[PDB]
Amino acid sequence: KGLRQDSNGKLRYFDLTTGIQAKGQFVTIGQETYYFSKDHGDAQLLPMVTEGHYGTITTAWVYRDQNNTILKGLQNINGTLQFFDPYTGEQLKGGVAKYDDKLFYFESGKGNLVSTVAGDYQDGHYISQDGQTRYADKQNQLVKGLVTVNGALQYFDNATGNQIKNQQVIVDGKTYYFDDKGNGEYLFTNTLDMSTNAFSTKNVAFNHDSSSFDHTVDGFLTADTWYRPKSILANGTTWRDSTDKDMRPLITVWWPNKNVQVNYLNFMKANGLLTTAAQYTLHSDQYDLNQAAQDVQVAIERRIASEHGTDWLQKLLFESQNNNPSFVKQQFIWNKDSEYHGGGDAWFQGGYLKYGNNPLTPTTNSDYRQPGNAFDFLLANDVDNSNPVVQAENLNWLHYLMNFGTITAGQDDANFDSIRIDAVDFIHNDTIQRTYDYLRDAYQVQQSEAKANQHISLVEAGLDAGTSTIHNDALIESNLREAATLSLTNEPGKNKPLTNMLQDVDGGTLITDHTQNSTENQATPNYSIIHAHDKGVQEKVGAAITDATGADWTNFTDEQLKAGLELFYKDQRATNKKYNSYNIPSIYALMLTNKDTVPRMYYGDMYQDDGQYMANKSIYYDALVSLMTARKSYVSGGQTMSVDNHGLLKSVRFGKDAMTANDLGTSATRTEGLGVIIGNDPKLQLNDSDKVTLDMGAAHKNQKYRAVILTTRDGLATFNSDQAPTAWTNDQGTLTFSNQEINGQDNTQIRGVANPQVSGYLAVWVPVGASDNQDARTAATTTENHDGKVLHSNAALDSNLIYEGFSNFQPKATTHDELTNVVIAKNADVFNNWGITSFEMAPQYRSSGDHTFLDSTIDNGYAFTDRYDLGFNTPTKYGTDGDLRATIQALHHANMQVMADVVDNQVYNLPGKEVVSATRAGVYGNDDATGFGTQLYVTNSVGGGQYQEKYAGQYLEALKAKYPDLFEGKAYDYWYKNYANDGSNPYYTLSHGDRESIPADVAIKQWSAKYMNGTNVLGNGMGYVLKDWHNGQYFKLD
Ligand SMILES: OC[C@H]1O[C@H](OC[C@H]2O[C@H](O)[C@H](O)[C@@H](O)[C@@H]2O)[C@H](O)[C@@H](O)[C@@H]1O
């Protein structure tokens, strides 16, 4: 058998196991690779091409020889068969070429020849028939089997002609994947059958007990597994019964596919264990591959004897040799290539794996894992917030945070008062609804504005957070940030008109209208920002790093951050800004004077990260101080806003108790109210007769005004007392400006300017004569609410002001006194004096430090393992637990409430391993259609830490006794955002929820996969948990 000469001297081949003649295929025998004809089966020697190197031409691959000439057609290169266009010599990858008047497929990875294709079709058409898709050829006949259709590899079931979509399929000993559109790719070539010989039978496992195998997880075997065989070939010579000390690697005796087996033989050859000129390819006869593996095993046993051990073998197969990835990691099925990272729905970390169920994984299965919101995955280990036990644990943690001082040191003035729900749209609605009911039970926020306004909570979303807007349990983000991004933050010539600032609209739904706002309790309670720790900041700091160093987020060091931050602030301080927003003061002037919003100041707009906390003031500092100071003293009453014929935005507040322009107001009103004039065109010039007006209203006739902000040539002049330039209203309450100075006072004229602080125009005007302690704010009342809403947008809510008190890119403290939390406490009275009523602290959880995302590289507190560790023993980035308690006390003693950033979405760096069923998925929690399919997967899912062990579940029995309502099932409503098909505006419908009852007697002392929805991709591959790929059956120990 094998290669046999016929009666006319011609060569033919017969498969060494089956005896079938080779026709229309390639076969590697000895050192040589032959083709055998599809007609008579006549051999053809394909010359081995060694030397040369892979090339480029204008943009594709070729291969050039020893004499630098470009090779064409079929080529036998170092044990692979490749095809190069017969004219340009451009390498074919992922397609078919004709040879011997039939079709062969060359895979998309390396262009290797891997299989036969039945036909290639261009002229047929798809049909829908008996509930299926099929393909009919040019004679209207159904096409069957593995084919190409219009250049795409596809498969149609042989019996029916039904097209296969979203499945892995075995065709003639090769495994492919066909995506959601039926488009195909090669995965691997299968092994035929294992050596049934006496040698192989000695290699069978001693038994199926766990003591016979290692590197196992939950009873499953992995690529790293070593095992005890029945017998051992001691010394390379003598079969003996194995002992309990004999262990050998499973991948010396068994391979998941042919590609791995061939790669193994060649690797071993290259490292001394096989001496031969024989070539091992995908076209080698399986018999010869099986035999050569046995010869490798002989040589291993000889070396095990010489070395008195297996430590050399551990290294050879499983560790990086010469900077190269290990043998295991070189294989497709054991690396990230078989996980198909990325895609549009893979927002971070290369995308996600979603957990499912499997009969063999009872300890990781779940009856839950529904997203219950519009998004699901984002980062790291995604917490299943639909799970009843997890929802209880969320109440436990919330309780812990809201009583942190009481619990850790008996200090009742050192507890958080409100929350931020981080990544709200990525957690199940039941947990959000239940969280709001907790705040209701604990603080009676629903009773009146006086209770609600003591606990002003917020979420990271707009109107889409339907559980947050249905009863206005928390503030949503207004559309101001997005609107200002269109009309103010861009360079000259890239801003839209300011008419987009007149209404606050979220996908066509009105949040509040500024044009003529004389009402109260109409607007959706909201916060307005321009920047945040993660809104409009990273991307720009990243561009700065790159011009500065060459690095970016995927590779940057601590020195490179510092270098990037130097360039960042240098840019920020110039007129012409390569990376920074324009018109920041003007945007803050809008934020701080608009009616029906609670503004939130960002730390980073006031201070610079090229210094320690609060050390370096930003260029915008004086202007934002001046704006906060004037808001406290003057801003109350109604609003009007319009854009005039010169493009200038004119905004007026009338002052306390004046809702309209025609309101005569009361005696408090006369010295309150203000006027704001903004332009976004730095070349604005008025003619000599043009006027710009502010209609201050009927309470402000014949009245002197004074500047708070004026645009100057170089920047902005700021004034915090009545010693400033002045101007007078006429008998209707109108202020009138022009291109002339008023009474010779510099910077009172209207004109476009370009400087570091403004690109267009900014002025702010307040009535003269306020007392030194005038406070235009409105106190909350104890009056009972009757409309079902927790928060109401009115003068009292408008009187609050939030401070986001951190940045991602702040540096590490070098001393106690530099720690953020120690500096905050010391500066408490500064915040109170600015009118901050809510201090939003960073998340205080200890960072995982694992560098798998930005959060765990600059250690901001969003990426943690132990969510109860708030700086016990050694500090977080911001301080120790004792510092945190002192900060909360200091803020409370300066009349602020303090907000806890509650991060229910994920947990990082859980070192303990488990096995779970997994499929590729995106942020929406939709199954992606990838070659990974659905595989059992070794996840990093078990852990938590010392404070979770100490505190998780500890308060549940007492919470159930005090607020039993929280542990019951409950019916509820919420708004749901729908996207229209025809590209018109999203629209809101009312959804119904029914949360489940939850238990008080199961604690989550450590995370594990049964409490998780999934994980970011880990790079182990589609086949690191071992199975028989012929029938799909996992190896599992009993
Ligand atoms: O390194 C030799 C290599 O050169 C070409 O492929 C390069 C590169 O092409 C794709 O991006 C693949 O995904 C990579 O794995 C490849 O290394 C030839 O096409 C290939 O035949 C050869 O191995």
Ligand SMILES: OC[C@H]1O[C@H](O)[C@H](O)[C@@H](O)[C@@H]1O
């Ligand atoms: O060309 C249009 C499409 O028609 C059918 O839906 C086929 O299943 C698909 O493979 C093809 O892409």
Ligand SMILES: [Ca+2]
């Ligand atoms: Ca989630």
Ligand code: NA
């Ligand atoms: Na509290």
